[PDB]
Amino acid sequence: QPSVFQCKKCFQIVGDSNAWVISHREYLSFTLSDAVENSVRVEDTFKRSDDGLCVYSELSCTRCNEVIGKVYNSTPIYLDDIRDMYTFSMDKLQAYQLGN
Amino acid sequence: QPSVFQCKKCFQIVGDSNAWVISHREYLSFTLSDAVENSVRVEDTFKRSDDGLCVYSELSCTRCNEVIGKVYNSTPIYLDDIRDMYTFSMDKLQAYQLGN
Ligand SMILES: [Zn+2]
Ligand SMILES: [Zn+2]
């Protein structure tokens, strides 16, 4: 049964499992191939990762302007699958699993 | 593909399809056999239907106190399928269909 993902603050649906790619328990994050277009804004600034191998732009929630994850623009070879995809911080989102 | 239903005001998920019973095109409403536990509050007043064949109590969104529908407590025999069941007003809700 699929889950839907929401901003924790305002409760805007950012996207669902189904468009899921991969999770990183190390990073405390998960990555979707797709997101709700109006719910999410990728910011117009490139920031250094902490490591700092990667380059990303923040994605903010459209409703409450929380920084809820990252779009990774440049990556090493091993982090290619999260590149140009929607990476959400677990800390910032909640999941609703459907019934039945 | 399933949908998920939220209050229009606060974005609280009140329930998903799958727990759906029936829809009425005439009155802008639909009916679910289930709702999210603390999502919804059924009020302490018995009100007459518009006809008024039925008796209902209002259901309110827990977070924002919007009247988003009705729990029909008493019905004629043909409207038994919606009795003791969660009837949401379409006007007060919004749907999110899952992708893929
Ligand atoms: Zn938000
Ligand atoms: Zn609400």
Numbering used by the authors:
A (entry chain A), B (entry chain B): 19 to 118
The authors write:
Mis18 is a key regulator responsible for the centromere localization of the CENP‐A chaperone Scm3 in Schizosaccharomyces pombe and HJURP in humans, which establishes CENP‐A chromatin that defines centromeres. Here, by combining structural, biochemical, and yeast genetic studies, we show that the oligomerization of S. pombe Mis18, mediated via its conserved N‐terminal Yippee‐like domain, is crucial for its centromere localization and function. Amino acid sequence and the predicted secondary structure analysis of Schizosaccharomyces pombe Mis18 suggested the presence of a highly conserved N‐terminal globular domain (residues 1–120; spMis181–120) mainly comprised of β‐strands, followed by a moderately conserved C‐terminal α‐helical domain (residues 121–end; spMis18C‐term‐α). Here, we show that fission yeast Mis18 and its human isoforms, Mis18α and Mis18β, possess two structurally distinct domains: an N‐terminal “Yippee‐like” globular domain and a C‐terminal α‐helical domain.
To structurally characterize spMis181–120, we purified recombinant spMis181–120 as a mono‐disperse sample and obtained crystals that diffracted X‐rays to about 2.6 Å. The structure was determined by single anomalous dispersion (SAD) exploiting the Zn anomalous signal from the bound Zn2+ ions in the crystals. The final model includes amino acid residues 19–118 of spMis181–120. The overall fold of spMis181–120 is formed by antiparallel β‐sheets: a three‐stranded (β1‐β2‐β9: β‐sheet I) and a six‐stranded (β3‐β4‐β8‐β7‐β6‐β5: β‐sheet II) sheet, arranged approximately perpendicular to each other. The two β‐sheets are held together by a Zn2+ ion coordinated via the C‐X‐X‐C motifs from loops L1 and L5. Although these proteins recognize substrates as diverse as nucleic acids to proteins, they do so via a common cradle‐shaped binding pocket formed by β‐sheet II. The asymmetric unit of the spMis181–120 crystals contained three copies of spMis181–120 assembled in a linear arrangement via two different interfaces (interface I and interface II), resulting in two potential dimeric structures (dimer I and dimer II). While the interface stabilizing dimer I is formed by the stacking of loops L5 and L7 of one monomer over their dimeric counterpart, the dimer II interface is formed by the stacking of β‐sheet I. In contrast, dimer II is stabilized by highly conserved residues (V22, I31, Y114, and L116) and has an extensive binding interface (as compared to dimer I) with a 1,431 Å2 buried surface area. Consistent with this, the other dimer II interface mutants Y114A, Y114E, and V22E also behaved as smaller entities compared to the wild‐type protein when analyzed by native PAGE, thus demonstrating that the dimerization of spMis181–120 is mediated via the dimer II interface.
